[PDB]
Amino acid sequence: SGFRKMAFPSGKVEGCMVQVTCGTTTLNGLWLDDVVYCPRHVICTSEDMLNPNYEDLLIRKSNHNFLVQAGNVQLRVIGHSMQNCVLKLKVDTANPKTPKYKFVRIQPGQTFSVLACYNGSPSGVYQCAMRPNFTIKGSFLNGSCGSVGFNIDYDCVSFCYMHHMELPTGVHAGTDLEGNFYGPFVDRQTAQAAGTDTTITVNVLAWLYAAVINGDRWFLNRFTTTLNDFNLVAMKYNYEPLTQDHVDILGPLSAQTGIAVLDMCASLKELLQNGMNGRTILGSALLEDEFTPFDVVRQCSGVTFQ
Amino acid sequence: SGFRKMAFPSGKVEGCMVQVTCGTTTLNGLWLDDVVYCPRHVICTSEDMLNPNYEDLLIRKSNHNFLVQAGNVQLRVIGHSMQNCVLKLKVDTANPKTPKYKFVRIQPGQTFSVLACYNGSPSGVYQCAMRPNFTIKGSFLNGSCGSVGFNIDYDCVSFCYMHHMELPTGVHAGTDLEGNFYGPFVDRQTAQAAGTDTTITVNVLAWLYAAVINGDRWFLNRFTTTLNDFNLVAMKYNYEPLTQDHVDILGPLSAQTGIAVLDMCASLKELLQNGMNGRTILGSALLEDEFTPFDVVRQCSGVTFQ
Numbered sequence A, B: 001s002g003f004r005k006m007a008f009p010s011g012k013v014e015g016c017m018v019q020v021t022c023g024t025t026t027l028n029g030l031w032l033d034d035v036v037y038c039p040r041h042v043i044c045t046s047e048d049m050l051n052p053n054y055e056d057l058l059i060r061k062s063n064h065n066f067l068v069q070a071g072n073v074q075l076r077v078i079g080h081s082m083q084n085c086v087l088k089l090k091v092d093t094a095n096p097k098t099p100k101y102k103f104v105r106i107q108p109g110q111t112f113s114v115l116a117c118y119n120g121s122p123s124g125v126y127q128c129a130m131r132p133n134f135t136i137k138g139s140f141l142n143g144s145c146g147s148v149g150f151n152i153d154y155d156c157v158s159f160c161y162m163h164h165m166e167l168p169t170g171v172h173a174g175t176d177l178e179g180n181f182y183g184p185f186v187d188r189q190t191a192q193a194a195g196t197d198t199t200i201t202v203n204v205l206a207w208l209y210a211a212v213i214n215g216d217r218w219f220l221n222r223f224t225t226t227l228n229d230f231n232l233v234a235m236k237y238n239y240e241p242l243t244q245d246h247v248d249i250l251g252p253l254s255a256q257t258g259i260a261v262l263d264m265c266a267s268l269k270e271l272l273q274n275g276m277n278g279r280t281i282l283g284s285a286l287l288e289d290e291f292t293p294f295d296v297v298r299q300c301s302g303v304t305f306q
């Protein structure tokens, strides 16, 4: 038993991280087969950051302007191209540590692991969720651009996020690995604001099921509610509305605990209206929304990876 | 910026995990050079667990009773011995992925990363602290014994924990890698209780400095206090007393923020006496004590590893 913010093991990703330098700008790249992927703003200088014309900036570069290092080994760049907001550098050596991988775009409410890197060297791993406003609440310092987010399904790494920038409010924005931003952001150093965030309701319910599995039961009651009665209260508290698909997704956790989803919703309704009265749930005094139903199942029933 | 529960990258450890089977009992082992380390209770059966005589149980075993698998490859066991509560299995092949490593015993209040494993396969990584009562608040299911805890200093993995059991209250107990338990526990299935836990004060202060670094300042004031006046309040709230060594350890965070340690103690004194009034610090509504001063520095100033 127990419940922790658990990240995926990062070994398969650590061997794909490299350092990319162009001019006096250095950041991280992702080396898969014979291509290195990195944020295209590596080709900017101080004068360009405010209103860069990336087509102009790239045509003025040649392959030898790009220094790629995998630890000690230098990788020879033999080609470059731009795909949306990511740069693809063709190199002369295929990465022998390339795992089975795919590029997926995730949805708000989904979670993934971030391998934070500096100078091509992995520094730490943590779990976060994609917020409804398409930002993530990460932990990133200068030099972290090009760090990636990923999930592991069996033996396959699904890359879903490449880090590009920090917004003024301290949250983070980036792209999928095809270079398309999450959210309405662009890779220029203008002041951009994220939309208002909401709480991910299906995740809060999954976390309450994890609490019950671990012996925290004080918030339960025998009331029930309907989807529509719940959603009326949820919207008042800036909670995402709950759909029938969400109910179905929680099925396995309902089955395992014997507490119907709409029963659990009645408990949540109560917690939203009267607070938690200085009591805690799984060691938190706030309702946690960055565990998916799948995260809970994986941690409270146990699945490994190859 | 930002602040997350960040674990060390686990790649260097993932390649040392193997599966150990003896009879119908299977758990995880740690394969370094030509030795596999695992909890000695792998040699117990249902009849033995309550009052095992490990010397008796081991003399009745031969090398061929131990099945060790590294993925597909079977490792031939060519010798066995017991060192305190860990079993050492000599195998015919040295692990080619053995990192630079050392075995260290950590102190209460220190943090480390746990690589949770099942059937020799890494499942997740998370950060925890060694509690003052020598337990950890982990997340472990059946089959997790032999999972290890570690820190990474530069290129060197310091192994500090091997998982042995879950106590009745849902917390976890284990040994260092020399097989000596943390705390007053023994590897038998008797009911054992942990002592009362306390809050790790130097860690709470480090976390308040991280909050200031990240722009949460609402709890500051201009009061100051003395070590002895603070410790009188701390003991009333089940907080570990604060020493001059702790003050010195926080120096770099005092320097970076311009807030003297005893000033920060006055803020903590206030938070303990009046609570947080439904305000939050770094996204928590409780005082967090599982980040060391070194954890904060690493995350709020940036250090990588080789």
Ligand SMILES: O=C(c1cc(=O)[nH]c(=O)[nH]1)N1CCC(c2ccc(Cl)c(Cl)c2)CC1
Binding pocket: A041, A044, A049, A052, A140, A141, A142, A143, A144, A145, A164, A165, A166, A172, A186, A187, A188, A189, B001
């Ligand atoms: O490395 C970081 C960084 C990331 C982070 O999350 N937090 C932090 O403090 N620093 N940089 C700041 C953004 C910079 C940039 C330059 C040019 C463009 Cl066009 C854009 Cl969009 C961004 C590159 C350098």
Ligand SMILES: O=C(c1cc(=O)[nH]c(=O)[nH]1)N1CCC(c2ccc(Cl)c(Cl)c2)CC1
Binding pocket: A001, B041, B044, B049, B052, B140, B141, B142, B143, B144, B145, B164, B165, B166, B172, B186, B187, B188, B189
């Ligand atoms: O794998 C787990 C496990 C760990 C955990 O943390 N949580 C959970 O639910 N299960 N086991 C329970 C302890 C068992 C044991 C058997 C014999 C002895 Cl002598 C001892 Cl001391 C312990 C081995 C199997």
